Design a protein around this motif. Sequence first.
Motif, PDB file in Angstrom:
ATOM      1  N   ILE A   1       0.835  -1.250   0.000  1.00  0.00           N
ATOM      2  CA  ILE A   1       0.000   0.000   0.000  1.00  0.00           C
ATOM      3  C   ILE A   1       0.854   1.277   0.000  1.00  0.00           C
ATOM      4  O   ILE A   1       0.280   2.365   0.263  1.00  0.00           O
ATOM      5  N   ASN A   2       2.158   1.173  -0.284  1.00  0.00           N
ATOM      6  CA  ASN A   2       3.086   2.328  -0.362  1.00  0.00           C
ATOM      7  C   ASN A   2       2.930   3.198   0.885  1.00  0.00           C
ATOM      8  O   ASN A   2       2.864   4.436   0.729  1.00  0.00           O
ATOM      9  N   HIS A   3       2.855   2.579   2.068  1.00  0.00           N
ATOM     10  CA  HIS A   3       2.791   3.269   3.383  1.00  0.00           C
ATOM     11  C   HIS A   3       1.729   4.379   3.355  1.00  0.00           C
ATOM     12  O   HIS A   3       1.957   5.357   4.067  1.00  0.00           O
ATOM     13  N   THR A   4       0.620   4.215   2.601  1.00  0.00           N
ATOM     14  CA  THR A   4      -0.507   5.199   2.496  1.00  0.00           C
ATOM     15  C   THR A   4      -1.019   5.524   3.906  1.00  0.00           C
ATOM     16  O   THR A   4      -1.322   6.674   4.172  1.00  0.00           O
ATOM     17  N   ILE A   5      -1.118   4.509   4.766  1.00  0.00           N
ATOM     18  CA  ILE A   5      -1.543   4.627   6.189  1.00  0.00           C
ATOM     19  C   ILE A   5      -0.671   3.677   6.996  1.00  0.00           C
ATOM     20  O   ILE A   5      -0.179   2.695   6.447  1.00  0.00           O
ATOM     21  N   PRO A   6      -0.491   3.912   8.308  1.00  0.00           N
ATOM     22  CA  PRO A   6       0.272   2.999   9.150  1.00  0.00           C
ATOM     23  C   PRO A   6      -0.225   1.545   9.107  1.00  0.00           C
ATOM     24  O   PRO A   6      -1.447   1.267   9.008  1.00  0.00           O
ATOM     25  N   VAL A   7       0.732   0.625   9.191  1.00  0.00           N
ATOM     26  CA  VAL A   7       0.476  -0.805   9.468  1.00  0.00           C
ATOM     27  C   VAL A   7       1.239  -1.121  10.751  1.00  0.00           C
ATOM     28  O   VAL A   7       2.361  -0.629  10.887  1.00  0.00           O
ATOM     29  N   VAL A   8       0.584  -1.787  11.702  1.00  0.00           N
ATOM     30  CA  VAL A   8       1.167  -2.110  13.034  1.00  0.00           C
ATOM     31  C   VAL A   8       0.940  -3.598  13.281  1.00  0.00           C
ATOM     32  O   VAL A   8      -0.158  -4.105  12.987  1.00  0.00           O
ATOM     33  N   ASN A   9       1.973  -4.297  13.753  1.00  0.00           N
ATOM     34  CA  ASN A   9       1.864  -5.724  14.148  1.00  0.00           C
ATOM     35  C   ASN A   9       1.568  -5.735  15.647  1.00  0.00           C
ATOM     36  O   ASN A   9       2.272  -5.054  16.395  1.00  0.00           O
ATOM     37  N   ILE A  10       0.451  -6.360  16.008  1.00  0.00           N
ATOM     38  CA  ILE A  10       0.024  -6.665  17.403  1.00  0.00           C
ATOM     39  C   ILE A  10      -0.430  -8.113  17.387  1.00  0.00           C
ATOM     40  O   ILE A  10      -1.337  -8.475  16.647  1.00  0.00           O
ATOM     41  N   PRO A  11       0.271  -8.992  18.134  1.00  0.00           N
ATOM     42  CA  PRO A  11      -0.122 -10.392  18.254  1.00  0.00           C
ATOM     43  C   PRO A  11      -1.601 -10.567  18.625  1.00  0.00           C
ATOM     44  O   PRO A  11      -2.177  -9.776  19.356  1.00  0.00           O
ATOM     45  N   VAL A  12      -2.194 -11.645  18.127  1.00  0.00           N
ATOM     46  CA  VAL A  12      -3.668 -11.847  18.200  1.00  0.00           C
ATOM     47  C   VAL A  12      -3.976 -12.635  19.490  1.00  0.00           C
ATOM     48  O   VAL A  12      -5.164 -12.877  19.768  1.00  0.00           O
ATOM     49  N   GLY A  13      -2.946 -12.952  20.291  1.00  0.00           N
ATOM     50  CA  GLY A  13      -3.085 -13.485  21.659  1.00  0.00           C
ATOM     51  C   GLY A  13      -1.761 -13.503  22.390  1.00  0.00           C
ATOM     52  O   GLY A  13      -0.759 -13.014  21.833  1.00  0.00           O
ATOM     53  N   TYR A  14      -1.763 -14.058  23.595  1.00  0.00           N
ATOM     54  CA  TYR A  14      -0.652 -13.968  24.567  1.00  0.00           C
ATOM     55  C   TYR A  14      -0.453 -15.314  25.259  1.00  0.00           C
ATOM     56  O   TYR A  14      -1.339 -16.175  25.145  1.00  0.00           O
ATOM     57  N   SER A  15       0.674 -15.478  25.952  1.00  0.00           N
ATOM     58  CA  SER A  15       1.012 -16.680  26.754  1.00  0.00           C
ATOM     59  C   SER A  15       0.452 -16.500  28.165  1.00  0.00           C
ATOM     60  O   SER A  15       0.931 -15.617  28.894  1.00  0.00           O
ATOM     61  N   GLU A  16      -0.532 -17.316  28.521  1.00  0.00           N
ATOM     62  CA  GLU A  16      -1.191 -17.310  29.854  1.00  0.00           C
ATOM     63  C   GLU A  16      -0.241 -17.979  30.845  1.00  0.00           C
ATOM     64  O   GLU A  16       0.567 -18.824  30.402  1.00  0.00           O
ATOM     65  N   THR A  17      -0.367 -17.666  32.136  1.00  0.00           N
ATOM     66  CA  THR A  17       0.485 -18.261  33.197  1.00  0.00           C
ATOM     67  C   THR A  17       0.210 -19.776  33.230  1.00  0.00           C
ATOM     68  O   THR A  17      -0.950 -20.175  33.003  1.00  0.00           O
ATOM     69  N   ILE A  18       1.253 -20.578  33.469  1.00  0.00           N
ATOM     70  CA  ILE A  18       1.220 -22.073  33.476  1.00  0.00           C
ATOM     71  C   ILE A  18       0.695 -22.532  34.839  1.00  0.00           C
ATOM     72  O   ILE A  18       1.194 -22.026  35.849  1.00  0.00           O
ATOM     73  N   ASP A  19      -0.274 -23.448  34.852  1.00  0.00           N
ATOM     74  CA  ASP A  19      -0.900 -23.970  36.096  1.00  0.00           C
ATOM     75  C   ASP A  19      -0.851 -25.507  36.088  1.00  0.00           C
ATOM     76  O   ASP A  19      -1.440 -26.110  37.001  1.00  0.00           O
ATOM     77  N   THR A  20      -0.137 -26.113  35.127  1.00  0.00           N
ATOM     78  CA  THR A  20       0.001 -27.588  34.954  1.00  0.00           C
ATOM     79  C   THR A  20       1.481 -27.961  34.960  1.00  0.00           C
ATOM     80  O   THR A  20       2.327 -27.107  34.702  1.00  0.00           O
ATOM     81  N   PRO A  21       1.845 -29.234  35.264  1.00  0.00           N
ATOM     82  CA  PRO A  21       3.248 -29.665  35.232  1.00  0.00           C
ATOM     83  C   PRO A  21       3.838 -29.642  33.805  1.00  0.00           C
ATOM     84  O   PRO A  21       3.086 -29.851  32.834  1.00  0.00           O
ATOM     85  N   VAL A  22       5.143 -29.363  33.731  1.00  0.00           N
ATOM     86  CA  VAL A  22       5.848 -29.111  32.438  1.00  0.00           C
ATOM     87  C   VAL A  22       7.058 -30.022  32.262  1.00  0.00           C
ATOM     88  O   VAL A  22       7.834 -30.149  33.200  1.00  0.00           O
ATOM     89  N   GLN A  23       7.173 -30.618  31.077  1.00  0.00           N
ATOM     90  CA  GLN A  23       8.376 -31.367  30.647  1.00  0.00           C
ATOM     91  C   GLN A  23       8.660 -32.457  31.683  1.00  0.00           C
ATOM     92  O   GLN A  23       9.840 -32.717  32.005  1.00  0.00           O
ATOM     93  N   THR A  24       7.613 -33.152  32.099  1.00  0.00           N
ATOM     94  CA  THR A  24       7.746 -34.477  32.747  1.00  0.00           C
ATOM     95  C   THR A  24       7.868 -35.511  31.621  1.00  0.00           C
ATOM     96  O   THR A  24       6.847 -36.104  31.261  1.00  0.00           O
ATOM     97  N   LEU A  25       9.075 -35.681  31.078  1.00  0.00           N
ATOM     98  CA  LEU A  25       9.379 -36.650  29.991  1.00  0.00           C
ATOM     99  C   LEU A  25       9.845 -37.959  30.626  1.00  0.00           C
ATOM    100  O   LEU A  25      10.138 -37.967  31.824  1.00  0.00           O
ATOM    101  N   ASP A  26       9.966 -38.994  29.802  1.00  0.00           N
ATOM    102  CA  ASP A  26      10.173 -40.407  30.204  1.00  0.00           C
ATOM    103  C   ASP A  26      10.784 -41.105  28.997  1.00  0.00           C
ATOM    104  O   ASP A  26      10.274 -40.859  27.886  1.00  0.00           O
TER     105      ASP A  26
END
Lengths: 502, 498
Positions: free
Chosen positions: B290-315
């Motif tokens: 669009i030849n910078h006719t108007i601003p374009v801004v990147n804003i992620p469409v979601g976020y990382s919520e706080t972890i409440d479950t166990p992580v990387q219990t591998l075997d």
Amino acid sequence: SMNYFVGNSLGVNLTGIEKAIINRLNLFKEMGRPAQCVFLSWNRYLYRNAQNYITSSDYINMYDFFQEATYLERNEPFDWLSYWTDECHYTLKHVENSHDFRIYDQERFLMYAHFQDPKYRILDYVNHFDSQRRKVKRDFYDVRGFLSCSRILVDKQQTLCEFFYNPEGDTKLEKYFSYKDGKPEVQKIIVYYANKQYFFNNETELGAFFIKQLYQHGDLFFSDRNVYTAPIFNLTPESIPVVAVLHSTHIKNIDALDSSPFKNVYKAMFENLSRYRAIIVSTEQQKLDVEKRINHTIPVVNIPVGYSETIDTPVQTLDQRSVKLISVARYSPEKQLHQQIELIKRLVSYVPKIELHMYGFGSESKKLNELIQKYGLENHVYLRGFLSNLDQEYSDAYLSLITSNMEGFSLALLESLAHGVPVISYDIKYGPNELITSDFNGYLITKNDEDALFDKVKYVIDHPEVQQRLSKGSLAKAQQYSKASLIKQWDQFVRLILEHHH
Amino acid sequence: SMNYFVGNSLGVNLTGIEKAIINRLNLFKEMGRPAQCVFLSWNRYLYRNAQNYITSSDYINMYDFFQEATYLERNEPFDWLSYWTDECHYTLKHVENSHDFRIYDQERFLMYAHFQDPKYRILDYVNHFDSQRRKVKRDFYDVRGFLSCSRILVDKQQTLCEFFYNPEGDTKLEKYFSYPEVQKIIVYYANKQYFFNNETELGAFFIKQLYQHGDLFFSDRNVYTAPIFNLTPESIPVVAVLHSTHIKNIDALDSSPFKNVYKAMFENLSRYRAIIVSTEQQKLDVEKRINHTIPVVNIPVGYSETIDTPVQTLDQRSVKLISVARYSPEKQLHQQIELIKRLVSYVPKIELHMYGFGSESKKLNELIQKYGLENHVYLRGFLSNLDQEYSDAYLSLITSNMEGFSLALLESLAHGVPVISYDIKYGPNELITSDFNGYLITKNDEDALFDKVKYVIDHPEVQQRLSKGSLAKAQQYSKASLIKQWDQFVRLILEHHH
């Protein structure tokens, strides 16, 4: 306890039935029995038409009833024009040779407004158009000011459905139509009443519902527009007392009393006689014929459809410079007014100061004017057209003529008798025998006996002392039909009907 | 000052745009900026769909607005069957295999009724019949219980007109149809009558009534909202949000036509204060186009919520690969089945779990049967909650020919699960740094995919390190980081507008 006289509506020119209902209301009011006119048809001008004859509390219209507009009068005047321009910012374009306006929102055509008056004070209708200028809705305004009915259109401005509003804009009735023979016909009616919905297939059922809502023990109904009212009363319980009122001959063929079919307008009443407490007719003669025909299955009573005012005006101020014959009769074939021309044609030889004045209007005027010209009677026979007031016309009248092949009770003839004008009439049903006693206030002549008509009219012209005697009989005859005689008849009838019913 | 997120409606099953809108609303409340979702379509079920996601005070539907039924909750139950029999004395005959009824007044057939529940406490619709059994009118009830629209029928049950009611039963809108499209809309609002030719004009009228000096609009369902915004004045600030690729073919950046859904927006760019996209990579493509006719801004469409479950219990018992992807052609999920057919000879206790749904279910499952991989590859279908599934996940696979910003990827990275992805637009480049939180692979290079997957499986110390990178990548897309981007954007957009 209320007496309800059920007709259809009131027009700008009152019919015979409309006048009969209003006259009866005035007698009940004078008498002190509560009475109201009941109207059935949707008529958003009814308040205007009624204004000159009855008060708002003197009638209940069915549509007004369900629209919560019963006893409502005229609103303060509203200037729709300023509302549309000042408040709505619409553009108003006047339509020339009209009280109409095209309403625009900038370049967009929205509405076509019709005003009744050229002062634009009475909005009549507003048509709404879509983006393709299709006419999709018509708003019909009551003369009292409120939006009465919106009509939804389809195809070529065919009526699909209608919504009826109270004055505040709430929907109180809906009607759905399908076309039959190129006309809209009701297929469904919904009514919002008593915080409920009620359903009907036609206006007869809605009518029957309306009667049931009015009635309380002690009330009495009169079926006056039987083509509509009888089918209605036929769908109501026999606990509701109703009297059938006939305003015309009861049968198609008066000369086949026993076997003639009933008139189509009375067919629904006569095919359900046991529904009705009595029949009222205008004349003793019709009473005797109807009683015989229905084998006395219900009572039949004659009560005249109007009364005579005693006259204070100058009466019978005659002079021998003019012998004035009169006819007060619609210019219609049944009145055979051509015969009266033929009478004057013969009579003028024997007194050329004779005049015949014919008061009325209708299809026969051209033919009557031709005959007048034909017979050279232009200074003898006058077609006076319609005259609302005839009171000055009666003062110098020698004699009234009736040459009809059929009649009904004539308030016109009653008024001319109150003015002392005697009458010579064919002996035809009904009315002449009621108002004419041979050699007392006039003469009855064998139907279509023009020679006997001539001889009798000539006899009265030749015997002014006979004319004076008949004139005094005319005053005496009219006085039998006094306001007070009619009241006494109505009071006694209502008393006896209620006692029997209860 | 209010922030308005303008979509169309809420389905039974929320779409991407619908979740994005609700998610953005939550963020705005949290940071103490007032936000409301704006809906357009007439949807007498909207309150039912909104219930488990947003409160009635968090959205304005255009029909609700003119029907004076915004912020209105469910009516207290009311017995229709006790009204029709005890108060109305009608007779009801149930129709076989339905929650329907026929209402008769004695012998007279009046209505066809249709409920939702077998408790018949929620009326749907009632058809009205004339004396010849013609269907004249249909009454449509709001899930909240009031009568919402009556539709008048003509000819072969064709729509002639529709009347929309407030809860007290006042007429607030009328629509007139020719053959069936709207030719006329009447609305009763502010003690007068307004006229429109179509729902786009009604839309613009609604936006003008909502707007008070200082509010901001977002155009989220652009195929409907752009044409609406195009008929509103420039004094009303609006931002366009793109939730997908902006052009029909991503390989023709310069020449490809704009997607049909985005045309009315891109053909009136000067109406918009900015375009929001989810990725820097998309921002740079759209800016250029669009030849910078108007601003374009990147804003992620979601976020990382706080972890409440166990992580990387591998075997060592089992190496658990996962795919969190719709079973669609673009996700090219057969390639992962092929990847497992090859790996299982080197890694006997490998498992691949694929979480999603869509057309490809049958083809994928038959491929598993064909390779005897029924003990190795599981089509898990859709799971509401994947929290328990990540705890033992060794790595995530993306084998798509095309992507968008992945909420799924952000979630699995927040659980310390590293990812091997094709290097395709858009989303992977945003969320993946090679040798930090996973590896980007040349698109459709299945040998290179095999090489990196086998390498991370052969070197558990590599998987642990890419896990620590995954947690760090997720921490960069925190809720608070997303809040601060939206906060500055809104303030800066409004600052420049006034």
